[PDB]
């Protein structure tokens, strides 16, 4: 409320609510990816666990945004959450490509919100994103690119063999 | 590569590579300073250890820049490393003055890169420098100024005595 | 200085300084190899760690030479450090071949310095090299040859698969 | 005796006995230096302890030579031990200069014996000296030069003050 | 000697000495196999360790036979030990086939000695072989057959890949 709100624009408040939607959508996408890889006809446990972990990380991101919204005196507003873009996610390669596309979209939304904060002279917002989101996103995208490269190297002329080996020797934990 | 690169300009990529060169040059300068103070005709162990520690710190700085370059999708490019500016470093006072000059040069390069990042709207770069370099540099320059002042107070009319006492009671560990 | 210098020729002093340059050049080469393998489009962690460890080992070698130079009363003299021979290092096989070529060059330089020491009747120098460098180099070259052979056996008709398996089952730690 | 003696020349046997004499003479010199610094009118405990420790180290050196003589089948032969060159040793500076002169003399004797062993193709003798004497001597001479330099820096225009400070802050343990 | 010898035929005594020769020959064969796999151009550590362990096991077998010979009052007689049948041992498959051939030969020699003992009514000899040799040999031959089958399954159309995988996932310890 207005009792604590200071230097917190309506534009930033709304963009924060939009970003919560994007993180919860991303969490939902990762839930769908994770359970696809748990199908008996897909059966790649390491890939399932990778994406289920990302579902939790994205929910945590939304939670942190909602805590900050209240710390600043803004009001959380929730919208409908769109279902994921696919019901079936193809190979590990297809899935990891979809995830990197998703992560770049979230990263661009973080950068856009940082730029709005900078324009509005809101350094608390800018520090919040830098401290809890920007480097986390850069680290995750780098990890996913490393994975993509290893998955791509393993396709060669024996795709099933490569897909099994990647799950067993890189992801399974 | 382009598979992960996002909001990372060619200008920042090149300046990062330049800054790696400056840190490795600084590491090399500190290696030369450290071993000069280990000469049998100089023999100031605390001063030697001070500069050898700084050689390692500057290498670590270069390492962190190289990790970040890859996290962002840029490409490390290495250049020849210039030898240090002196083969003999004079007194502890002369050496500490040279080190503060070196550190101010690195600090200015950090500030210049921060300003480029700000101009290019690259908040990850700006946060990286603020979080791992700017305050570390400020702390080190303050330490070195404190040392300079103590060394200068000890010169008086008995320079050898002062140089021994500083090494024994401030630096030796 | 002359206050401690005994049985230490100008020829050995200069060759020691040259060898410090070669070790620091080798360290720099291994830094470049290590970070190449950390690229998102290469992504072979075990190979990166192998070469980063070698960067540190070669720096340690230079450090030991510089300590001995001072123990003997010689004077360390530093020269410019040439950049590595390549900016991109190809496959793990290409890189391991380059490393063995580098190591044989360092080994020949050690042998040449040993021979100079023997000719100058400098047994301290000869023992120093035998005790801290010759067997270390032989052990490392044997390791690298073992690696080369395993990498070569894995190329067959599925190079990407072999390169992944070598990194995962031999190098990753 | 001849029952075990193999590749052990009469020349090396005699030079070993001569070297035992030199080490025991050096031990005796250090005993005299140590007790001089324990005089009530000299009273520099750290300097006394430094030289008493060196008396023990030199005796240990003689002991090791005598063990090796018997291991090789040679026969220990003892000669009269000359008294030290001085009854009073002057300042800490005078004493440290005398000690470095003594150590260089022992080092030259080690080098001469190494050269005889090399000429006689006696690698056990050569390794023995390299492993237990040459580097120990180099390390000690470097230490003594470092001390000389610090003592010399402290003389300035207040010699008593410098002599006290060196004993208290470098040697006293 | 005759002071303890009881129910111990000259035929069994001689066959025991022959069997010691066969075990020491087998130990020597396994030493050669082990070091072949340690060559830089073969480089299969698990295979090397497998055969070096077998060298020790076969020596232990000879030792046990020699202890028993003396327990029974027979006299150990040693003969020349023939060098192994090959200087180079080919692939892991070739080597494992040679080892199974060697083990079947030792097993037949054990069975022949058991039969001689049975014919001579020497139950101590028969129990000795049953208790310390027959089942050990059966277990080892079964292990080696299991290995052969796995090596053979891995040849397919990528022999190098299979040879690496067997060493890494079955033998390396
Ligand atoms: C002279 C410029 N160069 C050559 C590129 C240096 C200088 C200093 C270095 N210091 C280290 C170092 C220091 C402490 C602990 C670990 C390490 C290490 O693993 C690698 C190093 O590499 C170095 C290279
Ligand atoms: C032959 C006459 N000389 C030379 C003056 C000896 C003889 C025996 C010595 N034994 C020791 C000794 C023995 C045990 C533990 C410590 C020490 C030591 O610190 C110094 C010694 O100094 C010696 C000199
Ligand atoms: Cl939808
Ligand atoms: Cl230059
Ligand atoms: Cl160059
Ligand atoms: Cl005399
Ligand atoms: Cl034969």
Numbering used by the authors:
A (entry chain A), B (entry chain A), C (entry chain A), D (entry chain A), E (entry chain A): 1 to 173
What does the paper say about this structure?
As a scaffold for aromatic cluster design, we chose ferritin as a protein cage platform with a 12 nm outer diameter and an 8 nm inner cavity, composed of 24 subunits. To prove this concept through protein engineering, we focused on a two‐fold symmetric inter‐subunit interface of a recombinant horse spleen apo‐L ferritin (Fr) as a target region for mutagenesis. Herein, we present the construction of an aromatic cluster with an artificial molecular binding pocket at the two‐fold symmetric interface of ferritin and explore its ligand‐binding characteristics. We developed a system that uses ligand binding as a driving force to induce and propagate changes in the orientation of multiple aromatic side chains.
To create the ligand‐binding pocket, we first designed a mutant Fr‐F1 (Fr‐R59F) in which Arg59 was replaced by Phe59. Analysis of the 2Fo‐Fc maps revealed electron densities corresponding to Nile Red (NR) at the two‐fold symmetric interfaces of NR•Fr‐F1, NR•Fr‐F2, NR•Fr‐F4, and NR•Fr‐F6, observed as overlapping densities due to the interface symmetry. NR was positioned between two F59 residues, forming π–π stacking interactions in an F59–NR–F59' configuration. Anion‐π interactions between NR and E60 in NR•Fr‐F1 and NR•Fr‐F2, and CH‐π interactions between NR and F60 in NR•Fr‐F6, were identified, indicating NR's stabilization in the F59–F59' pocket via multiple non‐covalent interactions. Notably, NR•Fr‐F1 and NR•Fr‐F2, containing only one and two Phe residues, respectively, achieve higher quantum yields (94 and 95%, respectively) and longer lifetimes (5.54 and 5.75 ns, respectively) than NR•Fr‐F6 with six Phe residues per monomer. The hydrophobic and polar nature of the protein surface around NR influences its fluorescence properties, with the partially polar microenvironment in Fr‐F1 and Fr‐F2, attributed to Glu residues near the pocket entrance, potentially enhancing fluorescence. The quantum yield of Nile Red (NR) significantly increased from 0.50 in 100% methanol (MeOH) and 0.38 in a 50% MeOH‐water mixture to 0.88–0.95 upon encapsulation within Fr‐F1, Fr‐F2, Fr‐F4, and Fr‐F6. Furthermore, NR's fluorescence lifetime extended from 2.87 ns in organic solvent and 1.26 ns in aqueous‐organic mixture to 5.23–5.75 ns within these ferritin variants.
